[PDB]
Structure formats: structure tokens, C-alpha cells
């Protein structure tokens, strides 16, 4: 079963309609099928072109009075801001009056690559004391990045499989690379130190994690869900193995990014 779970994480998509704030204020759109596990800037040289003609005269994106961050993965952004919203996704395009106060300057392509490898490294740190990624010659890092950028699933996982192995003697990873985003995008994410297995050898379940680090998402009466707990657009069962979750439904940056919605 597992390999298909991985393929269907990798290829999850978001239908998206870019329209211009100045066409809306004055609405011909650009339709695209955004990869859920990529980042805006990575696939917005194209958008820059399409509307570059009309750019007679520094481009950012927005959604219902909310700038969209260049370094959160697309899928997480959708899940967190607009899961219940009707499709296709309506992203406003603004190339004037950049929100420096409420937005990071648009990263280059290399600056994103920086963030991506930096996240992969912060992940292998918590997973294997950095012993796995460090070993890798620079070319392997580049293979990871180019496999993401070019949607080459096979290429990318050829290298990532090593990063999802763990010692025989252990029942999983050291800690789990995870981030939890709550009410809004401007709300900080949550990251903590959690072990895949407890003292008694029991494998930890997502339910255990949310009970520990985020109990406000647990009905204190029946121990079941109080809010929506979304990952890659679905809601797994609170009794799902966190070790397995990390191995199979992390974003390519090896994190379990987890949206929480009331």
C-alpha cells in the first residue's frame, strides 16, 4: 500500500485561478494546477510572464485580505486558509504597494532553495542527529531540490528513501519533524520535541501528539476531535502511528505540517 500513499501525497494538486487586483478593481484569469508540496515563487515565473505583458511599468499574492507567504508549501497554505472554500482557488495578484510590514520580500529561486535545504537539515537533525543528510555529497542535495522543482517523483525519492530509514535496533526516528499551524497564517506555528514511541514501546498516535502539545484540539469529554485536523487535505484518525505519519505524509521538506481549523 505504502508506495501509493507516497505517490498520492506527491501529486496532490490545487486548481488555482490568478486574477489581477487591477482587473478586479477596474476579469481574465490564469488557470493553473499547483503542486501541493511546492512553494509559490517556485512556480510563479510563469505567472510573472503571463501578466508580464500587461506589466507596462515586485509581485506578491493575496487571498481575502491576507498576503501569502513564499516559504509555506502551497498545500498547507490552501488547507489552512481555504479548505472549506469552493474551488478553484481565487488568488489575487498584486504588483504594487508591497506589504513589507506583513510579508517577506519575494525570495529569489536560490533563496527558496536555501529555505528548503535548511528545513531538510533541521528535520534530519531531529531525526538522525544529522547523520544521514551530512553523509550526502552536495550533488545528492541538488538531486533532491531538482526533483522537487521538476515534479520528478522517482528522482526525488531515490534520495529521500535514505532519509526515511532508521536503525534496526530502534522502532523509528529520534524525534518527529512536525509543525502545527492553528487559527490563522499569522499565528506562529508550533514545534516541539516528541518521540515516535513512548517508554512502554507503544507507538505514539497523532492523538497522543495533539493531547500533549495542542490539547485545545481535543474535546475534553470524549477525547475525540473538537476541531478539524488537516494534513495534505485529509483528516487522519487520532489513532494513527506518528512514526508512519512521518515516514509517509511529510511534505518533501520532511516535516509533518499540520493545519488546525475550528
Amino acid at each position: 500500500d505504502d508506495k501509493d500513499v507516497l505517490r498520492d501525497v506527491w501529486f496532490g494538486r490545487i486548481p488555482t485561478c490568478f486574477t489581477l487586483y487591477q482587473d478586479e478593481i477596474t476579469a481574465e484569469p490564469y488557470y493553473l494546477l499547483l503542486p501541493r508540496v511546492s512553494y509559490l515563487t517556485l512556480v510563479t515565473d510563469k505567472v510573472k510572464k503571463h501578466f508580464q505583458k500587461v506589466m507596462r511599468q515586485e509581485i506578491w499574492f493575496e487571498y481575502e485580505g491576507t498576503p501569502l507567504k513564499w516559504h509555506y508549501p502551497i498545500g498547507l497554505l490552501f488547507d489552512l486558509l481555504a479548505s472549506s472554500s469552493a474551488l478553484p482557488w481565487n488568488i489575487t495578484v498584486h504588483f504594487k504597494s508591497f506589504p513589507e510590514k506583513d510579508l517577506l520580500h519575494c525570495p529569489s529561486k536560490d533563496a527558496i532553495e536555501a529555505h528548503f535545504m535548511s528545513c531538510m537539515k533541521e528535520a534530519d537533525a531531529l531525526k538522525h542527529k544529522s547523520q544521514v543528510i551530512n553523509e550526502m555529497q552536495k550533488k545528492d542535495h541538488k538531486q533532491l531540490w531538482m526533483g522537487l522543482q521538476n515534479d520528478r517523483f522517482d528522482q526525488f525519492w531515490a534520495i529521500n528513501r535514505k532519509l526515511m530509514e532508521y536503525p534496526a535496533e530502534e522502532n523509528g526516528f529520534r524525534y518527529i519533524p512536525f509543525r502545527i499551524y492553528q487559527t490563522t497564517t499569522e499565528r506562529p506555528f508550533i514545534q516541539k520535541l516528541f518521540r515516535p514511541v513512548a517508554a512502554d514501546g507503544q507507538l505514539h498516535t497523532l492523538g497522543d501528539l495533539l493531547k500533549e502539545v495542542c490539547p485545545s484540539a481535543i474535546d475534553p469529554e470524549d477525547g475525540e476531535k473538537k476541531n478539524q485536523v488537516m494534513i495534505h487535505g485529509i483528516e487522519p484518525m487520532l489513532e494513527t502511528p506518528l512514526q508512519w505519519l512521518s515516514e509517509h505524509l511529510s511534505y518533501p521538506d520532511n516535516f509533518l505540517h499540520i493545519s488546525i481549523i475550528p
Partner: peptide, 20 residues
């Protein structure tokens, strides 16, 4: 849980990709 994850992903794919 595994079957729920796989199937839910199946269905997720179908709504969002199928239609459009």
C-alpha cells in the same frame, strides 16, 4: 487507519482534480 488515509486521499484527489 491506513485504509482510511489511503481512501480519504483517493477521494481528495477525485474532488479537486476530477471536476476541473
Amino acid at each position: 487507519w491506513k485504509r482510511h488515509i489511503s481512501e480519504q486521499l483517493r477521494l481528495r484527489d477525485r474532488l479537486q482534480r476530477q471536476a476541473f
